[PDB]
Paper text:
A multi-protein E3 complex called LUBAC (linear ubiquitin chain assembly complex) is the only known E3 ligase able to generate polyubiquitin chains via M1 (Kirisako et al., 2006). The active core of LUBAC is located within the HOIP RBR domain, which cooperates with a C-terminal extension (the linear chain determining domain [LDD]) to provide chain linkage specificity (Smit et al., 2012, Stieglitz et al., 2012, Stieglitz et al., 2013). In contrast, RING2 is structurally close to an IBR-fold and encompasses a catalytic cysteine that forms a ubiquitin thioester intermediate before ubiquitin transfer onto a substrate (Stieglitz et al., 2013).
The RBR/dAb3 complex yielded three-dimensional crystals under two different conditions (see the STAR Methods), one of which contained only dAb3. Apo dAb3 crystallized as a dimer and its structure, which was solved by molecular replacement, revealed that the dimer interface is similar to the interface between VH and VK of a conventional antibody. To investigate if the oligomeric states seen in the crystal structures also occur in solution, apo dAb3, HOIP RBR and the HOIP RBR/dAb3 complexes were evaluated by SEC-MALLS. Of the ten dAbs selected, dAb3 readily produced crystals in the apo and RBR-bound form.
Author numbering:
A (entry chain A): 1 to 120
B (entry chain B): 1 to 119
Write the structure that this text describes.
Amino acid sequence: EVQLLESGGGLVQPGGSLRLSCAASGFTFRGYSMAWVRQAPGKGLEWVSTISPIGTYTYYADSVKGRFTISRDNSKNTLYLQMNSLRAEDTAVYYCAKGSYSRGTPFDYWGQGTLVTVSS
Amino acid sequence: EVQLLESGGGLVQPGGSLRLSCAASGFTFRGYSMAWVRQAPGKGLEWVSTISPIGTYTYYADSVKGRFTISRDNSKNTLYLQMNSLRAEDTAVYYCAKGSYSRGTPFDYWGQGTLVTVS
């Protein structure tokens, strides 16, 4: 019943822009921190950004500061990642992540992934 | 250098049992928590269970607590998931995932997945 539905990936040249979206079902956004993580080809998962439940606080990996913006719309149950000044090294599958209050993990649900290709 | 390979998936009758395993390479296995996550048809990834480095602590999603048991054998770099009383809701690709101590990533690698269908 819990679902995180991603969209927005695509193919761009360096300097391009994309907006990822993550629509949620089966829980209400307001209660939870949300995050974006990404897996670059042949690498391990890397954290991108986290946003607090009401959006008061946002956090960014050093590699995306000033270029990416996380935001959320709690009445829409949707999480966003605005990606500007895209770099080849941003090429990755991007996942949204639902914050959790369980002691077994700080995030207990992830989207299905959307591919971001920055090339040429 | 991290690599994870799940085994044991298959077709299971409703109410049946199945044991999955996960073999790991490229890291000191006993140094990390490990987890199972699963992807049902049409959905994203759902956290299933976590086990601590030596197995002292285990944690479960509410919908599998009790009928699932996570365990590990650190000398063989292997993680296990015993699944009992399986139901249609459990149909999914099951992945094992390596824990991480890095900011914002509780897990940093996960495996190829093994498919379990309950019907």
